[PDB]
Amino acid sequence: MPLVYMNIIMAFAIALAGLLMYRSHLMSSLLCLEGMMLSLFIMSTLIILNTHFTLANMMPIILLVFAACEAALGLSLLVMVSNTYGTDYVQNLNLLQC
Amino acid sequence: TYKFVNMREPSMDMKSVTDRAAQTLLWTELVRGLGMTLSYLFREPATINYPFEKGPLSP
Amino acid sequence: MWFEILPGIAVMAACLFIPGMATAHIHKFTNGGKEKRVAHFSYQWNLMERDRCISGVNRYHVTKGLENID
Amino acid sequence: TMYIAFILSTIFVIGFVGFSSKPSPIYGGLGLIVSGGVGCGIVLNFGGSFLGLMVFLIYLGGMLVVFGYTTAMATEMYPEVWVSNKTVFGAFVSGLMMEFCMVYYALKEEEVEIIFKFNGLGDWVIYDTGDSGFFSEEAMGIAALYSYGTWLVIVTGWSLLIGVVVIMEITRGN
Amino acid sequence: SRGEYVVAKLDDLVNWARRSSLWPMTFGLACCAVEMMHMAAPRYDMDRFGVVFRASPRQSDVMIVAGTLTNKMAPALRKVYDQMPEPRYVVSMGSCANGGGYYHYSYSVVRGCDRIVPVDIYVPGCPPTAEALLYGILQLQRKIKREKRLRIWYRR
Amino acid sequence: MFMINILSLIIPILLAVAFLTLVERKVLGYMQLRKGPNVVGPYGLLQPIADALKLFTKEPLRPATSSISMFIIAPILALSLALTMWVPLPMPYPLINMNLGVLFMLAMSSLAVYSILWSGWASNSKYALIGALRAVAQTISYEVTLAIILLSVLLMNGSYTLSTLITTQEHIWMIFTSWPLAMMWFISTLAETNRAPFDLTEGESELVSGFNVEYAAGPFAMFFMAEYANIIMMNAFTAILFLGASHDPHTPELYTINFVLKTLALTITFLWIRASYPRFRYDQLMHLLWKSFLPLTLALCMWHISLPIMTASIPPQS
Amino acid sequence: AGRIASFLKNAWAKEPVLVASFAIGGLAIILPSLSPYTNYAIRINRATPYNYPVPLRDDGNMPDVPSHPQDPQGPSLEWLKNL
Amino acid sequence: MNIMLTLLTNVTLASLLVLIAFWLPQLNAYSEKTSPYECGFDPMGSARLPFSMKFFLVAITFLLFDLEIALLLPLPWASQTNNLKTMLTMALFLLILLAASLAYEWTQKGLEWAE
């Protein structure tokens, strides 16, 4: 494996660590979630272009489509939470307990 | 006496409906405004050459 | 009058002439008086590289022919 | 070599470090736009012009909505930047140091991570000698989404329509 | 001297730009503002001379104080004047701006905008005609033409 | 020689921008029964030079509440992208010949959106924020409609190369072929370039100068230059895409003259529209595209997908 | 038919944009299945030689495969020449 | 390489313009000059307070439609295939589903701004 794949995988790991470590805002977590799919897109297209898997070139587009479907879902949930509580803080999502 | 500034209703015959639909799809009144401004472009400007020319005054 | 606008439009047109004519002249100058080769595909690029190799001067636009084969 | 792909990969990682340290959604979106553009550059070097331009365009459109939402839902009196907060600066510096350590180790020797084995050599080395002719393989493979891949089109269209229905239903309230 | 010649030419060039590009702020207070509109009108087109209204104070060089300045309004006038970046000039137009005008002995009128801001040109009249205001603008341009900032600095 | 070509592409564009400022002043004046600038130079030819010198010798200030980093970056990004959009345009030979030359321009325009957003947010003022949000809405609407319209028109072409656009328009004009899409594209370019009736981000009547309310001296001049460069570039793109000019490979100057004349005609049409119409409301602009253009745009996209197949007129791939 | 005529009259007087949109979309869906040139477009796409025509090893029992490109055997684009 | 050089030239020219603008003229800054602008009066609140977004749903629909246009963009190359009928059916299917999304949102009043 070249160092390029190493950098892309490291970027994905950084974005994954960003999502799992909340600070205050739910929006920042959504941005971290969008970055993970960007890294996945880049990695998949790098792999496909290098092996000349011609029919697999349509896969990154489907990846993007469901990426932005998830982004839409997250934005809708964020607006509902903001309407309820006044802020997008993750601290307010504490009514339910384990 | 008095007059109504805006109390007219449009006719619903097919020719008038088609004319209104053509005005909607083809921006007829917008082109009309463009033509008016073009006419003013080709008219003569109304600017005096101050200070070499002065506006009229009275005693 | 309305023709006092023309010098400004004339200057703007003169400014807009410069980029295209300059690009055409530079393309012809750097390609031996001919059009810059368009290589949109690997086949065209391979043709350009072959032209560079066969020219003997490391320039694809130096074209060789029958006098060069024999 | 010129190491263009490696440099762009490093900039990609740095942008990820930024928006993962998470200063505030404005600067997170800025970093994500930078990362998207640099990734477009990376895949352009690797060959995919359409894919690079598409990912860049999609993320430019997406980050526009995020700006409007963080102006409305996710804003505070003093938005945090990387140097504004101790936690954000600590995370940013940690990510930068980890990336620089990996880069230095890979350049100095064939770095084998605890997960995968990486060889420090040419991205130009790994490329292929063969060539196509008078068509773009990537463009043809993407255009095969309609002739081939009728199933993928169906599931994708159904997902998009259901996504519209869902986002309308979630925000209904009442 | 060579340096004196260079600075004279340079500050003639700089003064020409400021004279020939004047951007008054969109700021009118009372009946004197209608004559500003008539100066903007086709008859005495101010756009000929490079005089163009800008709404934002950050993008204006001249403040034409045209109308009565009241006690309730003086802070706003000073605020926008301060927000105008330098070099900036003031043209007080009409009697109300110049002195008190018809409202000099009033509890609610500032007797002159020169109590609030440093005024460069005073245009008399109630209201001054559009030609009078245009003459004031030209006099301001001729006043700018005499400024020698680089010539002062070289001898400084 | 490539640096020389870059300079020949950059400097004349800036000169044309300054004289477009002058031309717009004079055209609006003569349509409003005035004369416009005619005092500074011969027929007012030195007015843009005076304006530029005044702006760049005036003092620029950073507001106390502003974010200085994004306050500075935004004009830089705006002007950089405005100059960059010109590099793939064939006149008749592009500076940079791209296989996908249209998607590059779409992506760079979508990036040019963010300059006004970041300048408005960085200024930290309410008028700037309102202008930025108006920009967000406007870009939403015009972006979707522009994407689909360009897709259909290039579908009549065969590829995404502007030289192939010239080859396609060798015989007739895309305006004759597809005039409805041409009308909708012209409206969409008005919205994209923020020209009247869609000048909502910098709407002086409602907001005091809009998003660049806090910008002064040089940084303001850069926003003005970027906007006018975008105007000229969009008009040139429209002229290439719909008003095709005959190309002679041995004497390319004729194509340059025709292209310049058509670009000037479209720019003058922009100024004419600004002088002729009132300003939209931004909710009415959003409802205009989604509820009027988007249905017709989708129907015309279906029509232009089907038409080459049913008439056996599919363009060559290369 | 009167109900349909009244509905179309009302739609053409209130939403001509939508009337035109639906008409164009319907024409786009229906017309290609009736045009006789769809097969011609398919054949033109087939006739384009993107890749190399690899020759066949002759077994002595291939009368329909030309020995030379100019031989009468093989596909003919005479229909495309006069089109 | 050429595109990188062009981008570097454009960015360098813009940065030089900013540098000249911020260093050539005489500077005189004080508290009143650099205060925020609110038509001459001090702002009551802050510009960083939340600014309600009355078109929040249209933005999400814009995200989804941006995906749709991304799917539609490779159509010029897909029209060179031999399966013209399948290509046409799939393209029309995608466009009809996009139109159906728009019609559903329009009738369910998703394009009406919040009051």
Ligand SMILES: COC1=C(OC)C(=O)C(C/C=C(\C)CC/C=C(/C)CC/C=C(\C)CC/C=C(\C)CC/C=C(\C)CC/C=C(\C)CC/C=C(\C)CC/C=C(\C)CC/C=C(\C)CCC=C(C)C)=C(C)C1=O
């Ligand atoms: C307060 O109540 C009121 C009043 O009061 C009482 C009034 O009166 C009025 C009446 C007013 C009105 C009716 C209108 C006023 C309102 C407005 C909003 C103004 C309306 C005006 C217009 C619509 C048109 C006027 C024009 C405007 C506003 C545009 C402004 C112009 C600029 C910003 C120009 C600045 C930009 C420039 C100059 C471009 C930058 C320069 C360049 C690019 C040039 C650089 C070139 C180079 C670097 C190249 C150099 C190298 C070369 C040449 C070669 C070198 C080569 C080498 C090899 C070395 C009203 C309504 C009112 O309500």
Ligand SMILES: CCCCCCCCCCCCCCCCCC(=O)OC[C@H](COP(=O)([O-])OCC[N+](C)(C)C)OC(=O)CCCCCCCCCCCCCCCCC
């Ligand atoms: C960061 C960018 C680097 C690359 C720059 C590339 C070229 C840039 C081209 C654009 C220039 C823009 C300005 C144009 C000129 C007008 C403004 C002007 O004159 O500004 C000059 C500025 C002017 O200072 P000022 O802050 O008073 O500016 C006011 C200027 N007027 C009056 C005209 C409004 O000069 C300086 O700041 C320095 C003057 C001498 C003092 C030197 C101090 C030491 C540090 C620098 C010298 C080198 C030290 C080496 C050793 C270090 C270790 C000990």
Ligand SMILES: CCCCCCCCCCCCCCCCC[C@@H](O)O[C@H](CO[C@H](O)CCCCCCCCCCCCCCC)COP(=O)(O)OCC[N+](C)(C)C
């Ligand atoms: C935009 C890109 C940057 C350009 C950088 C500068 C490039 C050169 C700029 C061009 C300079 C133009 C100077 C114009 C001369 C003024 C014209 C003339 O009319 O002015 C006369 C003389 O003007 C002044 O005396 C001096 C003007 C400038 C003289 C030359 C200055 C130095 C120019 C050469 C140096 C430029 C390069 C060095 C800097 C880079 C006085 O007339 P005026 O009263 O007003 O007109 C009133 C109107 N009336 C008549 C109808 C009533």
Ligand SMILES: CCCCCCCCCCCCCCCCC[C@@H](O)O[C@H](CO[C@H](O)CCCCCCCCCCCCCCC)COP(=O)(O)OCC[N+](C)(C)C
């Ligand atoms: C009807 C069954 C109902 C119960 C099951 C419902 C499951 C969901 C609905 C699924 C319906 C489609 C299933 C069949 C997919 C066919 C895929 C493929 O095999 O057929 C294509 C044929 O496609 C046809 O043209 C029609 C495709 C379907 C048309 C639209 C149907 C939409 C129905 C689904 C609506 C969305 C709901 C999905 C979620 C419920 C390929 O033809 P071909 O030419 O050889 O392709 C060339 C390939 N080459 C190059 C290798 C030769």
Ligand SMILES: CCCCCCCC/C=C/CCCCCCCC(=O)OC[C@H](COP(=O)(O)OCCN)OC(=O)CCCCCCC/C=C/CCCCCCCC
């Ligand atoms: C390339 C150069 C093109 C130059 C074109 C310049 C035109 C003139 C420029 C001045 C106009 C610019 C300012 C005007 C901006 C706003 C214009 C505008 O409003 O247009 C939208 C207008 C107004 O809508 P409303 O009145 O609000 O009604 C809504 C009811 N709910 O509605 C529109 O959508 C019109 C857009 C044009 C539609 C195209 C005409 C469609 C005709 C279809 C027939 C062809 C079918 C093709 C199939 C052929 C079958 C054989």
Ligand SMILES: CCCCCCCC/C=C\CCCCCCCC(=O)O[C@H](COC(=O)CCCCCCC/C=C/CCCCCCCC)COP(=O)(O)OCCN
């Ligand atoms: C299936 C084939 C078509 C494929 C798709 C067609 C292309 C894309 C068009 C669809 C986009 C979305 C359509 C949305 C339709 C419903 C929207 C709606 O609610 O409209 C209402 C209802 O108004 C109507 O009248 C419904 C539209 C009726 C149009 C359908 C007519 C059918 C056309 C038959 C073709 C006849 C041929 C005549 C040719 C004439 C010349 C072209 C009015 O809108 P308002 O909410 O009042 O506006 C806001 C006011 N505050």
Ligand SMILES: CCCCCCCCCCCCCCCCCC(=O)OC[C@H](COP(=O)(O)OCCN)OC(=O)CCCCCCCCCCCCCCCCC
């Ligand atoms: C052929 C070879 C080349 C020949 C020509 C060479 C020079 C070309 C121009 C280079 C740029 C200008 C160089 C510096 C000029 C002198 C500026 C100066 O020192 O001004 C100092 C002075 C400040 O005032 P002071 O006396 O200090 O008072 C303190 C405040 N109470 O006064 C001021 O600060 C006055 C305010 C303005 C100062 C800046 C403007 C000076 C002239 C610039 C002209 C060119 C502008 C170009 C703009 C960018 C391009 C559009």
Ligand code: SF4
């Ligand atoms: S000086 Fe006269 S005209 Fe002017 S504001 Fe006062 S009363 Fe009105």
